[PDB]
Design a protein around this motif. Sequence first.
Motif, PDB file in Angstrom:
ATOM      1  N   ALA B  44       0.805  -1.215   0.000  1.00  0.00           N
ATOM      2  CA  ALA B  44       0.000   0.000   0.000  1.00  0.00           C
ATOM      3  C   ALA B  44       0.842   1.272   0.000  1.00  0.00           C
ATOM      4  CB  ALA B  44      -0.936   0.002   1.211  1.00  0.00           C
ATOM      5  N   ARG B  45       2.127   1.181   0.339  1.00  0.00           N
ATOM      6  CA  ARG B  45       2.952   2.364   0.540  1.00  0.00           C
ATOM      7  C   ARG B  45       3.721   2.792  -0.703  1.00  0.00           C
ATOM      8  NH1 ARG B  45       6.854   1.413   5.176  1.00  0.00           N
ATOM      9  NH2 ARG B  45       7.586  -0.395   3.981  1.00  0.00           N
ATOM     10  N   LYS B  46       4.034   1.864  -1.609  1.00  0.00           N
ATOM     11  CA  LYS B  46       4.826   2.222  -2.782  1.00  0.00           C
ATOM     12  C   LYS B  46       4.085   3.222  -3.663  1.00  0.00           C
ATOM     13  CE  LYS B  46       5.517  -2.232  -3.807  1.00  0.00           C
ATOM     14  NZ  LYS B  46       5.504  -3.045  -2.559  1.00  0.00           N
ATOM     15  N   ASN B  47       2.853   2.895  -4.038  1.00  0.00           N
ATOM     16  CA  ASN B  47       2.004   3.729  -4.871  1.00  0.00           C
ATOM     17  C   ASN B  47       0.807   4.164  -4.035  1.00  0.00           C
ATOM     18  OD1 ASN B  47       0.191   4.790  -6.816  1.00  0.00           O
ATOM     19  ND2 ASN B  47      -0.414   2.738  -7.496  1.00  0.00           N
ATOM     20  N   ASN B  48       0.067   5.157  -4.529  1.00  0.00           N
ATOM     21  CA  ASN B  48      -1.091   5.653  -3.795  1.00  0.00           C
ATOM     22  C   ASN B  48      -2.281   4.713  -3.959  1.00  0.00           C
ATOM     23  OD1 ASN B  48      -0.900   8.360  -2.344  1.00  0.00           O
ATOM     24  ND2 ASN B  48       0.209   8.812  -4.241  1.00  0.00           N
ATOM     25  N   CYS B  49      -2.057   3.422  -3.715  1.00  0.00           N
ATOM     26  CA  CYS B  49      -3.091   2.393  -3.766  1.00  0.00           C
ATOM     27  C   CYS B  49      -3.124   1.726  -2.398  1.00  0.00           C
ATOM     28  CB  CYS B  49      -2.811   1.378  -4.875  1.00  0.00           C
ATOM     29  SG  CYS B  49      -1.099   0.802  -4.958  1.00  0.00           S
ATOM     30  N   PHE B  50      -4.150   2.036  -1.617  1.00  0.00           N
ATOM     31  CA  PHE B  50      -4.120   1.846  -0.175  1.00  0.00           C
ATOM     32  C   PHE B  50      -4.599   0.455   0.225  1.00  0.00           C
ATOM     33  CE2 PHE B  50      -5.594   6.397  -0.822  1.00  0.00           C
ATOM     34  CZ  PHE B  50      -4.313   6.822  -1.097  1.00  0.00           C
ATOM     35  N   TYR B  51      -4.291   0.090   1.469  1.00  0.00           N
ATOM     36  CA  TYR B  51      -4.793  -1.126   2.089  1.00  0.00           C
ATOM     37  C   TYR B  51      -5.122  -0.847   3.546  1.00  0.00           C
ATOM     38  CZ  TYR B  51      -5.382  -5.916   3.659  1.00  0.00           C
ATOM     39  OH  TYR B  51      -5.892  -7.081   4.188  1.00  0.00           O
ATOM     40  N   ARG B  52      -5.997  -1.678   4.101  1.00  0.00           N
ATOM     41  CA  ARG B  52      -6.490  -1.507   5.460  1.00  0.00           C
ATOM     42  C   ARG B  52      -7.129  -2.815   5.902  1.00  0.00           C
ATOM     43  NH1 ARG B  52      -9.089  -3.826   3.298  1.00  0.00           N
ATOM     44  NH2 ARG B  52     -11.312  -3.708   2.768  1.00  0.00           N
ATOM     45  N   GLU B  53      -7.696  -2.791   7.101  1.00  0.00           N
ATOM     46  CA  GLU B  53      -8.660  -3.779   7.549  1.00  0.00           C
ATOM     47  C   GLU B  53      -9.984  -3.063   7.757  1.00  0.00           C
ATOM     48  OE1 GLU B  53      -7.767  -6.937   7.599  1.00  0.00           O
ATOM     49  OE2 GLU B  53      -9.777  -7.654   8.113  1.00  0.00           O
ATOM     50  N   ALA B  54     -11.081  -3.806   7.682  1.00  0.00           N
ATOM     51  CA  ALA B  54     -12.371  -3.230   8.028  1.00  0.00           C
ATOM     52  C   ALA B  54     -12.518  -3.199   9.538  1.00  0.00           C
ATOM     53  CB  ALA B  54     -13.517  -4.024   7.410  1.00  0.00           C
ATOM     54  N   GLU B  55     -13.733  -2.954  10.018  1.00  0.00           N
ATOM     55  CA  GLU B  55     -14.035  -3.214  11.415  1.00  0.00           C
ATOM     56  C   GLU B  55     -13.596  -4.628  11.767  1.00  0.00           C
ATOM     57  OE1 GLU B  55     -16.057  -2.309   8.831  1.00  0.00           O
ATOM     58  OE2 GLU B  55     -18.135  -2.765   9.379  1.00  0.00           O
ATOM     59  N   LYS B  57     -14.600  -7.142  13.016  1.00  0.00           N
ATOM     60  CA  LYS B  57     -15.577  -8.226  12.997  1.00  0.00           C
ATOM     61  C   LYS B  57     -15.872  -8.765  14.387  1.00  0.00           C
ATOM     62  CE  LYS B  57     -12.668 -10.674  10.649  1.00  0.00           C
ATOM     63  NZ  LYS B  57     -12.073 -11.793   9.868  1.00  0.00           N
TER      64      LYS B  57
ATOM     65  N   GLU E  58      10.010   6.366   0.074  1.00  0.00           N
ATOM     66  CA  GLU E  58       8.625   6.269  -0.379  1.00  0.00           C
ATOM     67  C   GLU E  58       7.665   6.858   0.648  1.00  0.00           C
ATOM     68  OE1 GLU E  58       8.134   2.159  -1.371  1.00  0.00           O
ATOM     69  OE2 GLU E  58       8.149   2.542  -3.535  1.00  0.00           O
ATOM     70  N   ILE E  62       4.944   9.813   0.277  1.00  0.00           N
ATOM     71  CA  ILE E  62       3.552   9.709   0.711  1.00  0.00           C
ATOM     72  C   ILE E  62       3.175  10.888   1.600  1.00  0.00           C
ATOM     73  CG2 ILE E  62       2.238   8.477   2.496  1.00  0.00           C
ATOM     74  CD1 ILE E  62       2.550   5.962   1.079  1.00  0.00           C
TER      75      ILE E  62
ATOM     76  N   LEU F  64     -10.245   3.411   3.725  1.00  0.00           N
ATOM     77  CA  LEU F  64      -9.446   2.422   3.017  1.00  0.00           C
ATOM     78  C   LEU F  64      -8.002   2.330   3.495  1.00  0.00           C
ATOM     79  CD1 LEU F  64     -10.777   0.661   0.902  1.00  0.00           C
ATOM     80  CD2 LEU F  64     -11.852   2.927   0.764  1.00  0.00           C
TER      81      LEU F  64
ATOM     82  N   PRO G 133     -19.111  -6.482   8.350  1.00  0.00           N
ATOM     83  CA  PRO G 133     -17.796  -5.923   8.014  1.00  0.00           C
ATOM     84  C   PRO G 133     -17.508  -5.982   6.522  1.00  0.00           C
ATOM     85  CG  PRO G 133     -17.641  -7.343   9.923  1.00  0.00           C
ATOM     86  CD  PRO G 133     -19.015  -7.546   9.361  1.00  0.00           C
ATOM     87  N   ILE G 139      -7.475  -1.610  -3.859  1.00  0.00           N
ATOM     88  CA  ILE G 139      -8.087  -0.391  -4.365  1.00  0.00           C
ATOM     89  C   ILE G 139      -7.040   0.435  -5.101  1.00  0.00           C
ATOM     90  CG2 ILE G 139      -9.841  -0.358  -2.562  1.00  0.00           C
ATOM     91  CD1 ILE G 139      -7.393   2.333  -2.231  1.00  0.00           C
TER      92      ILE G 139
END
Lengths: 186, 223, 125, 66, 86, 180, 155
Positions: B44-55, B57, E58, E62, F64, G133, G139
Amino acid sequence: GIALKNVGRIKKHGRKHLVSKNPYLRLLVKLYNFLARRTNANFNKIIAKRLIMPKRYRPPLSLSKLQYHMANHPNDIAVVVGSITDDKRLFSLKQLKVCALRFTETARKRIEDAGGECLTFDQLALKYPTGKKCVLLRGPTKARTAEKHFGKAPGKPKSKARPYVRSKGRKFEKARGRRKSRAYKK
Amino acid sequence: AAKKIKTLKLINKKKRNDLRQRTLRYEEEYESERKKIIELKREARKNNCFYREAEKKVVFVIRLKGVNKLPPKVRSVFRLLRLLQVHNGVFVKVNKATKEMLKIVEPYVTYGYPTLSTVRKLLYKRGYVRVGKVRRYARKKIQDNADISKHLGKYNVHGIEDMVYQLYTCGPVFKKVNNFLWAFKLKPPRKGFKAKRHAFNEPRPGDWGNREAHINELINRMI
Amino acid sequence: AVKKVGKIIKKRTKKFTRFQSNRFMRVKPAWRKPRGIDCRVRRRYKGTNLMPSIGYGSNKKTKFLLPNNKYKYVVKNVKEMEPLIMNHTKYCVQIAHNVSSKKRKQIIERAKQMNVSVINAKARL
Amino acid sequence: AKSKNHTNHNQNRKAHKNGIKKPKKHKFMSRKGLDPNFFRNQKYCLKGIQKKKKELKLKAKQEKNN
Amino acid sequence: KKRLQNKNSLTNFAVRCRLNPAYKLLRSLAVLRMRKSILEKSKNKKEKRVQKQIQKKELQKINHDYYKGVAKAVKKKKKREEKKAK
Amino acid sequence: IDNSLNTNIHQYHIVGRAIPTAKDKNPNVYRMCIFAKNDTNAKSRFWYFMKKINKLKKSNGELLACEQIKERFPLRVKNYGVLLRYDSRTGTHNMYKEFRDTTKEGAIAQLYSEMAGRHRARASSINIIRISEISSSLVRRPHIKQLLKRRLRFPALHLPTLQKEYRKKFASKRPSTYRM
Amino acid sequence: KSRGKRSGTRYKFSKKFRKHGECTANKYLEKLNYGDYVDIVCDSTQQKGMPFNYYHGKTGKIFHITKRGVGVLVNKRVKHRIEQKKVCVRIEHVRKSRCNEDFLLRKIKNAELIKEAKLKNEHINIKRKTEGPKPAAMIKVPPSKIITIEPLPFY
RNA sequence: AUUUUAAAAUUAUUUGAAUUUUUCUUCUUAUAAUUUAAGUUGUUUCUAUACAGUACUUUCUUAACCCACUCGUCUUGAAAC
RNA sequence: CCUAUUAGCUGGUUAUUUUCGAAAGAUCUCUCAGGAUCGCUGGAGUUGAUUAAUAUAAUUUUACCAGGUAGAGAUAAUGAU
RNA sequence: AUUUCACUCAUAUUAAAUAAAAUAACUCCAAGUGGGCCAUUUUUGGUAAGCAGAACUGGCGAUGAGGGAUGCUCCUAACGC
């Protein structure tokens, strides 16, 4: 403090111990309690529960009704936790082997003369410990007159309850509220 | 009858090596999960294409108020959340229904994201289990895997190792782990609350509401 | 306060007294549950004649034994001691109050030669 | 003197004491005054079914008892 | 069966290993990892830092994107306020 | 590190967007940066401002990514900029603000005590806007110019406060007030 | 002091704005069956067969059907218990309910999905999801796409 | 007195195995122990080398710190002027 | 003396522990200091459950209904102004 | 419409979630009660009232404990030793 129904104590309903002080019945209850606990069968558990029931829940079973119930298996053992009474309306009886608490002596004589035999619950435990080939029956529990006065009160619409009256004549609780001519009916 | 003792002896080693292979697979799965989450986060850090977790659960809820002076539906939600005493804690599966029902008891509880170390601590030092037959449960501390296997082993969740791995990651079995657990009976916080009267989200000091990740310190301070 | 000697534990001494029995002399100290309406003892007010309850019940493993660590048994004559030949270590003997002098003597002697202790062995002599 | 004319206080607490009891929802309901001239024919339908069965069972019993 | 003492399933080593058969292996693996000598952590830190130079670059990218975004949001806010000033 | 002297703020930046719908296939992603007591409090404040300025709340907002972005050098000396808006018992008022601490984190907290002490405005009644940086010669406040003066001094009208260990009750003779 | 049959029904039984006039002609073409869920809503243009005060907007099963009437089995709460009540209304005041329309198309789903999946021998769940969830995915946001929003002062 | 046993851990071996790379690396083939298992045991003194005291148990009487309004009753509400 | 007349009214109504535990609504009443009857409660008993599931729920979710209170309006109607 | 035969619709996590959900359901007998009051929010009459009359929930009554110096109703919290 903690929020529980009836402070978290499970409540059971119905009989807990035998009330009768008849030593033979106490011995029977002990025997069948042991049988129900050790043997896994629901047969012994049901018999043990029924042995301590009140008198109104050990109703009589007539010879005719017993034979009708046992018609479709003639070689099995008919076990009831009530008393067996004779039915004069029955012309003939044949070959019934019945275990019961009590037999009215006329019914007993009729059963023996028909070729069958009467057993007590100690015999039933001795030679049928798990209730194999045994069908357990019971007489009509709420056919007695007391339940005829129970349910919806007499005076409620469509109430079949019998009233408590001194007499059952024309002059005794028959005029107003029991016929359309006098105010209302029922 | 002499064969019985030896056939019940060999099955112990059989199941021992069965769970020994299974735990090798377990640890491989665990380390693989740890590697996957960090690698997705790093990508997620190299390019502006993100990652996360949801709530997450799964949420841990601590009751804050007593049993007196509560609205009837608040009391009903407490009952069916199994939160009956002033310091009870439970794990609640996060979805729309549970979240809506929790929103109605929001001012009387504080809840948040448990995290793995905290759920392990809760199960290891505060974990009590319902052992008896149906509706006759007889609360018992874990102290062994035998009862966990008796109630859940036929459902292949035998072991506290297997059971933390089921509570933390809200896996295919919560009906049989959360329900199997007795409600946690927690001590008061070691350093005390701020104000049970006020929300955690108010600028003024307060306690109730969703602490999210900030519930771990509260739990291990109440543990 | 709880008195503890050996394994015998007594959760409370100084038995409960009836409310207002100290200031009213027609009220005997024997305990009575106060029904009342605003009683200050039924309501469990602070610092006023706390009521007995099942919580004070002694451990049933040591419920009836004396500081003897034995259960007392009151005997009225000889040959009434007979069951204690098998329980000489679990039971002690107390002689009935209305037993004469040499009747007392001849069961004290029997108890001693039976190896069972007598509580009131120095009575009427 | 003056009386409390009315209040609904504590009433639904009493109602929820033994819960809000629900109707029993039996499988069959009486047809006593429901759509006559339709259930009369259902009575006829049922009789038409029982009619053959009675005699069939009687014949089977006689032939098996000789 | 009789209730004994509830042994601490975290500090009691025998009970904890009984509850978690993999705990002894995991703990030994961590213990030897701590037991790794000081020279091992002394010699490789510069290599690990020069291997994360690109990652921190990087992250600089950001976060500097965020700084530019905040700066330009400030710029447009000021431009709109100055337009509305009269 | 002194916990008695310390506030409890670190940097956050959590990235998301309003919920994409069938009606609006690709809603634009958005952003805003504030500080508060902790990250969850910051999220609550952000969603409060989202609801008040636009039409979106937790129920129709998702994210996200999330990160914590500390400052370039924590132990610098800074001059940054914000503005205040607060409501009193009878109205609403506003101003700007810039106070000097080490960095951004504690920059907010010194103003809350000031507002509480001077106007009895509770923290629920105060809104701070537009964190940025300020110059030094542009201060229009009677104090902050001599903060960056070339050379400045004042005496030590200090009244002593010592450790509880040495804060003894009975003194041999009366202490003085010069020290140093 | 006043508890007439139509008391307190000033607005409930009033006809809606633009909605006056008798019921539409094709409303009399509803296929009602026994045991059918039905909504009982008053149509004050028709005075006979009118539902009573409390049953407007309620739902119940058909227990009786006549030439122009319908018997609806409505549970009503009475103090400590709910009891069943047989309300007899005209067809103008009864409307086929949309409660079981949520279930009926799912039962249609079953005969076409489960039937093939079972013979294919694939274990697929059918229960409703009640989505919570939001699962983890990948993305893509362009750096141009990130625009901003910022707070406001008092005016 | 026909699960304080089985395992769990530890020690001393031993067989094979493996991998982190080995003096707390991991798993049984086997042995013998031990407790961290499988809710406190040990040592030394004293009571004490007495037959009831200045000790120990207990009752009572006095204090002392904290607390404590007359009960019964009608009452929504009684310590009630 | 009938007569210990009647009193919907006042006062009293005697051992312990344990367990469960209210109502001060409602309908009718020459009823308003009373009564009957529901409701709340105890005891007894059967049928059940004991099979982490069904019945069930002062709960939520999904789907679908019904409302005209807050608000809004005098331009939309009456009533105003 | 009913009946009888076929086929079969997750049931080995349960036709949405959660649930010390069978502490369930039903029957019988019967007690006491049927003067209530207070708090938040809403509201009618009234200038107003610790006033009169209502709605929701919780309490006081029937209940002590810690705090509000003090207090039947406030806050915390409900009670075996």
